[PDB]
Structure 1
Protein backbone atom coordinates (compact mmCIF):
# COMPACT_ATOMS: atom_id res chain seq x y z
CA UNK A 1 0.00 0.00 0.00
CA UNK A 2 1.24 3.49 -0.90
CA UNK A 3 -0.28 6.87 -0.05
CA UNK A 4 0.71 10.47 -0.75
CA UNK A 5 -0.82 13.62 0.75
CA UNK A 6 -0.24 17.31 0.97
CA UNK A 7 -2.05 20.46 2.09
CA UNK A 8 -1.43 24.12 1.27
CA UNK A 9 -3.88 26.54 2.92
CA UNK A 10 -1.74 29.23 1.31
CA UNK A 11 1.50 29.32 -0.68
CA UNK A 12 4.94 30.54 0.41
CA UNK A 13 7.27 32.50 -1.88
CA UNK A 14 9.79 30.17 -3.55
CA UNK A 15 7.82 26.94 -2.97
CA UNK A 16 10.53 24.33 -3.64
CA UNK A 17 8.06 21.43 -3.42
CA UNK A 18 6.19 22.84 -6.46
CA UNK A 19 7.41 22.90 -10.07
CA UNK A 20 6.38 26.34 -11.32
CA UNK A 21 6.32 26.50 -15.13
CA UNK A 22 5.80 29.40 -17.56
CA UNK A 23 4.57 32.62 -15.95
CA UNK A 24 3.52 31.29 -12.53
CA UNK A 25 4.50 33.29 -9.43
CA UNK A 26 3.48 33.29 -5.79
CA UNK A 27 1.88 36.55 -4.62
CA UNK A 28 2.70 38.28 -1.34
CA UNK A 29 -0.91 37.48 -0.32
CA UNK A 30 0.06 33.76 -0.67
CA UNK A 31 -1.78 32.89 -3.90
CA UNK A 32 -0.55 30.87 -6.83
CA UNK A 33 -0.83 33.40 -9.64
CA UNK A 34 -0.81 31.28 -12.77
CA UNK A 35 -1.09 34.04 -15.40
CA UNK A 36 0.71 37.39 -15.37
CA UNK A 37 -0.62 40.51 -13.74
CA UNK A 38 0.95 43.90 -14.52
CA UNK A 39 -0.24 47.06 -12.72
CA UNK A 40 -3.24 45.20 -11.30
CA UNK A 41 -4.37 44.09 -14.79
CA UNK A 42 -4.13 40.64 -16.40
CA UNK A 43 -1.66 40.31 -19.27
CA UNK A 44 -2.71 38.64 -22.50
CA UNK A 45 -1.02 35.63 -24.04
CA UNK A 46 0.19 34.40 -20.61
CA UNK A 47 0.48 30.75 -19.61
CA UNK A 48 1.53 29.28 -16.25
CA UNK A 49 1.49 25.88 -14.58
CA UNK A 50 2.25 24.53 -11.11
CA UNK A 51 2.88 20.86 -10.30
CA UNK A 52 3.59 19.05 -7.03
CA UNK A 53 7.27 18.08 -7.07
CA UNK A 54 6.85 14.40 -6.14
CA UNK A 55 5.58 11.92 -8.68
CA UNK A 56 2.32 10.32 -7.63
CA UNK A 57 2.00 6.53 -7.91
CA UNK A 58 -1.33 6.31 -9.70
CA UNK A 59 -1.30 2.63 -10.74
CA UNK A 60 1.02 -0.40 -10.57
CA UNK A 61 1.30 -2.92 -13.44
CA UNK A 62 2.88 -5.62 -11.26
CA UNK A 63 0.04 -5.82 -8.73
CA UNK A 64 -2.58 -4.61 -11.26
CA UNK A 65 -3.87 -2.01 -8.77
CA UNK A 66 -5.11 1.52 -9.42
CA UNK A 67 -5.16 4.37 -6.91
CA UNK A 68 -8.06 6.33 -5.58
CA UNK A 69 -7.47 10.04 -5.20
CA UNK A 70 -9.16 13.20 -4.09
CA UNK A 71 -8.03 16.78 -4.51
CA UNK A 72 -9.66 20.00 -3.35
CA UNK A 73 -8.71 23.55 -4.23
CA UNK A 74 -10.01 27.08 -4.24
CA UNK A 75 -9.53 29.38 -7.22
CA UNK A 76 -10.51 32.82 -8.50
CA UNK A 77 -10.90 34.03 -12.07
CA UNK A 78 -11.20 37.84 -12.46
CA UNK A 79 -12.00 39.09 -15.99
CA UNK A 80 -12.17 42.89 -16.54
CA UNK A 81 -14.93 42.15 -19.07
CA UNK A 82 -16.82 38.90 -18.43
CA UNK A 83 -18.08 38.57 -22.03
CA UNK A 84 -14.45 38.64 -23.25
CA UNK A 85 -13.14 36.14 -20.63
CA UNK A 86 -10.39 33.82 -21.89
CA UNK A 87 -9.11 31.10 -21.73
CA UNK A 88 -9.43 29.23 -18.40
CA UNK A 89 -7.85 26.98 -15.82
CA UNK A 90 -7.43 23.22 -15.46
CA UNK A 91 -6.38 20.66 -12.91
CA UNK A 92 -4.47 17.84 -14.56
CA UNK A 93 -2.44 14.65 -14.36
CA UNK A 94 0.40 14.12 -16.86
CA UNK A 95 3.73 12.29 -17.30
CA UNK A 96 6.40 13.15 -14.74
CA UNK A 97 8.44 15.09 -17.35
CA UNK A 98 5.44 17.21 -18.55
CA UNK A 99 6.25 20.68 -19.91
CA UNK A 100 3.93 23.57 -20.94
CA UNK A 101 2.47 23.21 -24.45
CA UNK A 102 0.47 25.74 -26.53
CA UNK A 103 -1.07 28.83 -24.88
CA UNK A 104 -4.60 30.27 -25.31
CA UNK A 105 -7.46 27.83 -25.84
CA UNK A 106 -5.15 24.80 -25.56
CA UNK A 107 -4.56 25.82 -21.90
CA UNK A 108 -0.88 24.86 -21.88
CA UNK A 109 -1.94 21.22 -22.02
CA UNK A 110 -1.86 20.22 -25.68
CA UNK A 111 0.24 20.91 -28.78
CA UNK A 112 -2.86 20.99 -31.04
CA UNK A 113 -6.65 20.52 -30.91
CA UNK A 114 -6.60 16.83 -31.93
CA UNK A 115 -6.90 13.63 -29.94
CA UNK A 116 -3.59 11.81 -29.35
CA UNK A 117 -3.07 8.90 -26.96
CA UNK A 118 0.61 9.80 -26.47
CA UNK A 119 -0.43 12.97 -24.63
CA UNK A 120 -1.19 10.82 -21.54
CA UNK A 121 -3.28 13.66 -20.06
CA UNK A 122 -6.38 13.63 -17.89
CA UNK A 123 -7.70 17.06 -16.99
CA UNK A 124 -10.66 18.89 -15.58
CA UNK A 125 -11.05 22.29 -17.29
CA UNK A 126 -12.83 25.46 -16.28
CA UNK A 127 -13.23 26.89 -19.74
CA UNK A 128 -14.12 30.57 -20.15
CA UNK A 129 -13.83 30.99 -23.96
CA UNK A 130 -15.70 29.22 -26.75
CA UNK A 131 -13.15 27.81 -29.19
CA UNK A 132 -14.20 26.07 -32.42
CA UNK A 133 -14.19 22.68 -30.65
CA UNK A 134 -16.17 23.90 -27.56
CA UNK A 135 -19.84 23.65 -26.65
CA UNK A 136 -21.87 26.86 -26.39
CA UNK A 137 -21.26 28.78 -23.17
CA UNK A 138 -18.67 28.66 -20.43
CA UNK A 139 -18.29 25.12 -19.14
CA UNK A 140 -16.53 22.56 -16.99
CA UNK A 141 -15.08 19.65 -18.95
CA UNK A 142 -13.44 16.29 -18.38
CA UNK A 143 -10.60 15.94 -20.91
CA UNK A 144 -8.74 12.76 -21.87
CA UNK A 145 -5.82 13.19 -24.31
CA UNK A 146 -7.53 16.09 -26.06
CA UNK A 147 -8.73 19.64 -25.58
CA UNK A 148 -12.05 18.35 -27.00
CA UNK A 149 -13.72 17.32 -23.77
CA UNK A 150 -15.17 13.84 -23.30
CA UNK A 151 -18.00 15.39 -21.25
CA UNK A 152 -19.00 18.96 -20.37
CA UNK A 153 -21.56 20.86 -18.28
CA UNK A 154 -22.56 24.50 -18.37
CA UNK A 155 -20.92 26.63 -15.71
CA UNK A 156 -21.52 30.34 -15.19
CA UNK A 157 -18.32 32.11 -14.20
CA UNK A 158 -18.91 34.18 -11.08
CA UNK A 159 -16.45 36.87 -11.78
CA UNK A 160 -13.86 37.41 -9.05
CA UNK A 161 -15.61 35.01 -6.62
CA UNK A 162 -13.96 32.10 -4.82
CA UNK A 163 -14.76 28.69 -6.37
CA UNK A 164 -14.29 25.58 -4.21
CA UNK A 165 -13.51 22.51 -6.33
CA UNK A 166 -13.33 18.84 -5.40
CA UNK A 167 -12.09 16.26 -7.93
CA UNK A 168 -12.08 12.60 -6.98
CA UNK A 169 -11.32 9.29 -8.65
CA UNK A 170 -12.90 6.00 -7.59
CA UNK A 171 -10.77 3.19 -9.03
CA UNK A 172 -13.37 0.42 -8.48
CA UNK A 173 -15.89 2.14 -10.83
CA UNK A 174 -13.27 4.01 -12.97
CA UNK A 175 -15.23 7.18 -12.20
CA UNK A 176 -13.84 10.71 -12.16
CA UNK A 177 -16.02 13.26 -10.38
CA UNK A 178 -15.59 17.05 -10.36
CA UNK A 179 -17.68 19.54 -8.40
CA UNK A 180 -17.53 23.31 -8.06
CA UNK A 181 -19.31 25.41 -5.42
CA UNK A 182 -19.54 29.22 -5.13
CA UNK A 183 -20.41 29.73 -1.45
CA UNK A 184 -21.03 33.46 -2.12
CA UNK A 185 -24.07 32.75 -4.33
CA UNK A 186 -24.99 29.20 -3.19
CA UNK A 187 -24.48 27.91 -6.73
CA UNK A 188 -23.04 24.45 -7.43
CA UNK A 189 -22.04 22.20 -10.32
CA UNK A 190 -21.07 18.58 -10.70
CA UNK A 191 -20.18 16.09 -13.40
CA UNK A 192 -18.69 12.68 -13.63
CA UNK A 193 -17.51 10.23 -16.24
CA UNK A 194 -15.79 6.91 -16.77
CA UNK A 195 -12.05 7.47 -17.19
CA UNK A 196 -9.77 4.43 -17.16
CA UNK A 197 -6.55 5.80 -15.64
CA UNK A 198 -4.61 2.56 -16.17
CA UNK A 199 -5.24 2.84 -19.93
CA UNK A 200 -4.52 6.61 -20.21
CA UNK A 201 -1.67 7.51 -17.83
CA UNK A 202 1.73 6.13 -16.96
CA UNK A 203 2.22 4.48 -13.57
CA UNK A 204 3.71 7.64 -12.10
CA UNK A 205 2.38 11.11 -12.88
CA UNK A 206 2.72 14.68 -11.77
CA UNK A 207 -0.40 16.58 -10.78
CA UNK A 208 -1.24 20.26 -10.72
CA UNK A 209 -2.70 23.31 -12.41
CA UNK A 210 -2.46 25.12 -15.69
CA UNK A 211 -4.09 28.32 -16.89
CA UNK A 212 -3.92 30.64 -19.88
CA UNK A 213 -5.12 34.18 -20.65
CA UNK A 214 -6.53 35.05 -24.09
CA UNK A 215 -4.41 35.54 -27.22
CA UNK A 216 -5.79 39.06 -27.84
CA UNK A 217 -5.39 42.07 -25.59
CA UNK A 218 -9.10 42.58 -24.84
CA UNK A 219 -9.70 38.89 -23.93
CA UNK A 220 -7.97 38.59 -20.57
CA UNK A 221 -8.50 37.35 -17.02
CA UNK A 222 -6.50 36.38 -13.92
CA UNK A 223 -6.23 32.77 -12.68
CA UNK A 224 -5.28 32.40 -8.98
CA UNK A 225 -5.24 29.24 -6.84
CA UNK A 226 -5.70 30.07 -3.13
CA UNK A 227 -5.36 26.65 -1.48
CA UNK A 228 -4.87 23.03 -2.47
CA UNK A 229 -5.09 19.59 -0.86
CA UNK A 230 -4.32 16.22 -2.45
CA UNK A 231 -4.64 12.62 -1.16
CA UNK A 232 -3.92 9.43 -3.16
CA UNK A 233 -4.15 5.82 -2.01
CA UNK A 234 -2.76 2.90 -4.04
CA UNK A 235 -4.16 -0.19 -2.29
CA UNK A 236 -2.67 -3.63 -1.79
CA UNK A 237 -3.78 -6.18 -4.40
CA UNK A 238 -6.86 -8.35 -3.84
Structure 2
Protein backbone atom coordinates (compact mmCIF):
# COMPACT_ATOMS: atom_id res chain seq x y z
CA UNK A 1 0.00 0.00 0.00
CA UNK A 2 0.86 3.69 -0.28
CA UNK A 3 2.31 5.51 2.71
CA UNK A 4 4.64 8.45 3.05
CA UNK A 5 6.05 10.39 5.97
CA UNK A 6 8.84 12.76 6.67
CA UNK A 7 10.53 13.72 9.99
CA UNK A 8 13.41 16.09 9.36
CA UNK A 9 13.74 16.17 13.17
CA UNK A 10 11.58 14.73 16.02
CA UNK A 11 10.23 17.90 17.64
CA UNK A 12 7.01 16.14 16.60
CA UNK A 13 6.45 12.41 17.31
CA UNK A 14 2.78 12.54 16.50
CA UNK A 15 2.88 9.21 14.65
CA UNK A 16 5.76 7.50 16.49
CA UNK A 17 5.12 4.82 19.05
CA UNK A 18 7.75 4.30 21.82
CA UNK A 19 8.01 0.91 23.61
CA UNK A 20 10.40 -0.52 26.15
CA UNK A 21 13.30 1.76 26.83
CA UNK A 22 13.00 4.09 23.85
CA UNK A 23 11.94 7.69 24.23
CA UNK A 24 11.91 11.06 22.47
CA UNK A 25 14.87 13.15 23.62
CA UNK A 26 16.53 16.29 22.29
CA UNK A 27 14.66 16.25 18.92
CA UNK A 28 15.77 12.61 18.31
CA UNK A 29 14.53 9.09 18.83
CA UNK A 30 16.67 7.70 21.70
CA UNK A 31 16.42 3.93 21.39
CA UNK A 32 17.86 2.81 24.71
CA UNK A 33 17.63 4.58 28.05
CA UNK A 34 20.17 6.65 29.99
CA UNK A 35 20.11 7.37 33.69
CA UNK A 36 19.82 10.79 35.34
CA UNK A 37 23.58 11.25 34.91
CA UNK A 38 23.35 10.57 31.15
CA UNK A 39 24.96 7.14 31.58
CA UNK A 40 23.72 4.24 29.31
CA UNK A 41 21.65 1.76 31.15
CA UNK A 42 22.72 -1.89 30.77
CA UNK A 43 20.50 -4.67 29.53
CA UNK A 44 17.60 -2.61 28.02
CA UNK A 45 15.89 -2.63 24.64
CA UNK A 46 13.54 -0.19 23.04
CA UNK A 47 11.53 0.34 19.91
CA UNK A 48 10.44 3.51 18.14
CA UNK A 49 8.03 2.69 15.32
CA UNK A 50 5.87 4.46 12.82
CA UNK A 51 2.45 3.90 14.31
CA UNK A 52 0.35 3.22 11.15
CA UNK A 53 0.30 -0.25 9.62
CA UNK A 54 0.86 -0.77 5.93
CA UNK A 55 0.77 -3.69 3.55
CA UNK A 56 3.66 -5.11 1.44
CA UNK A 57 1.76 -6.86 -1.32
CA UNK A 58 2.65 -5.40 -4.74
CA UNK A 59 4.67 -2.59 -3.02
CA UNK A 60 8.12 -1.02 -3.33
CA UNK A 61 9.53 1.36 -0.70
CA UNK A 62 12.33 3.78 -0.04
CA UNK A 63 13.32 5.00 3.40
CA UNK A 64 16.23 7.05 4.66
CA UNK A 65 17.34 8.03 8.12
CA UNK A 66 20.20 9.63 9.92
CA UNK A 67 21.68 8.22 13.07
CA UNK A 68 24.36 8.62 15.70
CA UNK A 69 25.98 5.87 17.86
CA UNK A 70 27.14 7.51 21.07
CA UNK A 71 29.77 5.40 22.89
CA UNK A 72 31.33 5.87 26.29
CA UNK A 73 34.01 3.20 25.85
CA UNK A 74 35.90 1.04 23.32
CA UNK A 75 33.59 -1.84 24.13
CA UNK A 76 30.10 -0.66 23.30
CA UNK A 77 27.09 -3.08 22.93
CA UNK A 78 24.79 -3.96 21.16
CA UNK A 79 23.67 -1.80 18.33
CA UNK A 80 20.34 -1.12 16.64
CA UNK A 81 18.27 -2.05 13.63
CA UNK A 82 15.59 -0.76 11.28
CA UNK A 83 12.95 -3.55 11.13
CA UNK A 84 9.62 -4.63 9.67
CA UNK A 85 7.28 -6.88 11.60
CA UNK A 86 3.61 -7.29 12.37
CA UNK A 87 1.87 -4.42 14.12
CA UNK A 88 1.79 -6.18 17.49
CA UNK A 89 5.47 -7.14 17.46
CA UNK A 90 6.69 -6.27 20.94
CA UNK A 91 10.08 -5.23 22.29
CA UNK A 92 12.03 -8.54 22.75
CA UNK A 93 15.28 -9.36 24.50
CA UNK A 94 18.08 -6.84 25.23
CA UNK A 95 21.74 -7.56 24.63
CA UNK A 96 22.77 -9.17 21.36
CA UNK A 97 19.14 -10.02 20.52
CA UNK A 98 18.82 -6.29 19.56
CA UNK A 99 15.32 -6.09 20.91
CA UNK A 100 14.15 -8.33 18.03
CA UNK A 101 14.51 -11.96 19.20
CA UNK A 102 14.57 -14.08 22.33
CA UNK A 103 17.20 -16.56 23.42
CA UNK A 104 15.35 -19.81 22.76
CA UNK A 105 14.33 -19.14 19.22
CA UNK A 106 16.77 -16.43 18.02
CA UNK A 107 18.29 -18.63 15.28
CA UNK A 108 15.11 -20.48 14.37
CA UNK A 109 13.81 -19.08 11.17
CA UNK A 110 10.47 -20.94 11.45
CA UNK A 111 9.75 -19.29 14.84
CA UNK A 112 10.23 -15.59 13.88
CA UNK A 113 8.60 -13.15 11.49
CA UNK A 114 10.82 -10.06 11.35
CA UNK A 115 13.13 -8.56 8.74
CA UNK A 116 15.80 -6.01 9.66
CA UNK A 117 18.94 -4.13 8.71
CA UNK A 118 21.18 -4.32 11.76
CA UNK A 119 24.09 -2.17 12.90
CA UNK A 120 25.91 -4.52 15.24
CA UNK A 121 28.48 -3.11 17.64
CA UNK A 122 29.23 -6.26 19.69
CA UNK A 123 30.64 -9.50 18.38
CA UNK A 124 28.53 -12.23 19.93
CA UNK A 125 29.94 -15.75 20.52
CA UNK A 126 26.53 -17.16 21.42
CA UNK A 127 25.55 -17.53 17.76
CA UNK A 128 27.43 -17.31 14.47
CA UNK A 129 28.42 -13.84 13.47
CA UNK A 130 31.54 -12.18 12.06
CA UNK A 131 34.54 -11.50 14.28
CA UNK A 132 34.30 -7.77 13.64
CA UNK A 133 31.56 -5.15 14.07
CA UNK A 134 29.16 -5.42 11.10
CA UNK A 135 26.08 -4.28 9.26
CA UNK A 136 23.66 -7.10 8.30
CA UNK A 137 20.35 -8.04 6.75
CA UNK A 138 18.37 -10.36 9.05
CA UNK A 139 15.45 -12.51 7.90
CA UNK A 140 13.72 -14.26 10.77
CA UNK A 141 17.02 -14.88 12.62
CA UNK A 142 19.71 -13.08 14.53
CA UNK A 143 22.26 -14.84 12.27
CA UNK A 144 22.33 -12.44 9.30
CA UNK A 145 21.68 -13.78 5.82
CA UNK A 146 24.02 -11.04 4.38
CA UNK A 147 26.69 -9.28 6.41
CA UNK A 148 29.55 -6.92 5.87
CA UNK A 149 32.32 -5.40 7.97
CA UNK A 150 31.49 -2.05 9.59
CA UNK A 151 34.73 -0.15 10.01
CA UNK A 152 35.62 0.86 13.53
CA UNK A 153 36.65 4.31 12.28
CA UNK A 154 33.05 4.82 11.25
CA UNK A 155 31.47 3.08 14.30
CA UNK A 156 33.34 5.44 16.61
CA UNK A 157 33.21 8.52 14.35
CA UNK A 158 30.61 10.48 16.36
CA UNK A 159 29.29 11.45 12.94
CA UNK A 160 25.67 11.74 11.86
CA UNK A 161 25.55 8.79 9.40
CA UNK A 162 22.95 8.21 6.69
CA UNK A 163 21.15 4.98 5.77
CA UNK A 164 19.07 4.36 2.67
CA UNK A 165 16.95 1.20 2.66
CA UNK A 166 14.92 0.21 -0.33
CA UNK A 167 12.67 -2.68 -1.33
CA UNK A 168 12.02 -3.46 -4.97
CA UNK A 169 8.67 -5.27 -4.97
CA UNK A 170 9.07 -6.52 -8.51
CA UNK A 171 12.51 -8.11 -8.14
CA UNK A 172 11.93 -8.90 -4.42
CA UNK A 173 15.20 -7.32 -3.33
CA UNK A 174 16.00 -5.49 -0.09
CA UNK A 175 19.00 -3.12 -0.24
CA UNK A 176 20.80 -0.96 2.31
CA UNK A 177 23.32 1.76 1.49
CA UNK A 178 25.01 3.35 4.53
CA UNK A 179 27.23 6.39 4.23
CA UNK A 180 29.52 8.35 6.57
CA UNK A 181 30.64 11.99 5.93
CA UNK A 182 34.30 11.67 4.90
CA UNK A 183 34.09 7.98 5.89
CA UNK A 184 32.99 4.55 4.67
CA UNK A 185 30.24 3.56 2.38
CA UNK A 186 28.42 0.22 2.67
CA UNK A 187 26.29 -1.79 0.28
CA UNK A 188 24.15 -4.83 1.17
CA UNK A 189 21.39 -6.50 -0.82
CA UNK A 190 19.37 -9.65 -0.47
CA UNK A 191 16.66 -11.40 -2.41
CA UNK A 192 13.64 -11.85 -0.12
CA UNK A 193 9.94 -11.87 -0.88
CA UNK A 194 8.58 -9.66 1.89
CA UNK A 195 4.92 -10.17 0.93
CA UNK A 196 5.33 -13.88 1.35
CA UNK A 197 6.72 -13.44 4.85
CA UNK A 198 4.16 -10.75 5.68
CA UNK A 199 0.85 -11.36 4.04
CA UNK A 200 -1.06 -8.90 6.20
CA UNK A 201 -0.16 -5.64 7.85
CA UNK A 202 3.26 -4.57 9.09
CA UNK A 203 4.87 -1.68 10.92
CA UNK A 204 8.34 -0.26 10.30
CA UNK A 205 10.57 1.08 13.00
CA UNK A 206 13.72 0.94 14.98
CA UNK A 207 14.99 -1.31 17.72
CA UNK A 208 18.07 -0.66 19.90
CA UNK A 209 19.62 -2.60 22.69
CA UNK A 210 22.25 -2.59 25.36
CA UNK A 211 24.66 -3.98 26.32
CA UNK A 212 26.84 -1.28 27.82
CA UNK A 213 28.49 2.07 27.10
CA UNK A 214 26.25 2.91 24.11
CA UNK A 215 23.18 4.94 23.20
CA UNK A 216 21.66 4.96 19.70
CA UNK A 217 19.83 7.97 18.27
CA UNK A 218 17.75 8.53 15.19
CA UNK A 219 17.96 12.15 14.00
CA UNK A 220 15.66 12.19 10.95
CA UNK A 221 13.59 9.66 8.96
CA UNK A 222 11.50 9.68 5.83
CA UNK A 223 9.62 6.91 3.98
CA UNK A 224 7.68 6.44 0.81
CA UNK A 225 5.94 3.38 -0.56
CA UNK A 226 4.20 2.88 -3.89
CA UNK A 227 2.22 0.20 -5.64
CA UNK A 228 4.00 -1.92 -8.33
CA UNK A 229 0.82 -2.40 -10.48
Q: So what's the TM-score if we normalise by structure 1? A: 0.89
Q: Which residue of 2 aligns with 1:67?
A: 59
Q: Which runs of 5+ in 1 are unaligned?
A: 60-65
Match for 2:100 among 103, 106, 109?
Answer: 109
**What residue is the counterpart of 2:206 in the other structure?**
209
Match of 2:132 among 104, 128, 137: 137
Write out the 4+ residue segments of structure 1 that deviate beyond 6 Å after TM superposition. Answer: none
- 1:80 counterpart (72, 79, 83): 72
Q: Distance in 2 between matches of 1:198 and 1:117?
A: 16
Structure 2, unaligned runs of 5 or more: none
- Contact 1:24/1:33 (<8 A) preserved: yes
| 1:21-100 to 2 correspondences below 5 Å | 21-27=19-25, 29-38=26-35, 39-59=37-57, 66-82=58-74, 84-100=75-91
CA distance in 2, matches of 1:45, 1:159: 24
> For 2:79 and 2:189, how far apart are their aligned partners in 1?
20
Partner SS, residue 172 of structure 1? coil
SS state at 1:228 partner: strand
More off after superposition, 36-45 vs 165-174: 36-45
Measure the CA separation in 2 of the matches of 1:70 and 1:192.
14
Contact 1:79 1:159 in 2 (8 A): no
Aligned mates of 1:167, 1:74 — CA distance in 2? 12
- 1:105 is paired with a residue whose SS is helix
TM-score (norm 2): 0.92
- Render the CA deviation track for 1:141-175: whole Å, top value 9, x for unaligned: 00000001001000121342211000001112111
Q: Please give the alpha-carbon distance, in whole angstroms, between the structure 2 residues aligned to 1:197 and 1:211.
A: 22
Partner of 1:63: none
Residues 50 and 209 in structure 1, CA contact (< 8 A), matched pair in contact too: yes
Superposed CA deviations along residues 1-49 of structure 1, whole A, max 9, x for unmatched, are: x410000011136x2411110011111x201111112212211112110
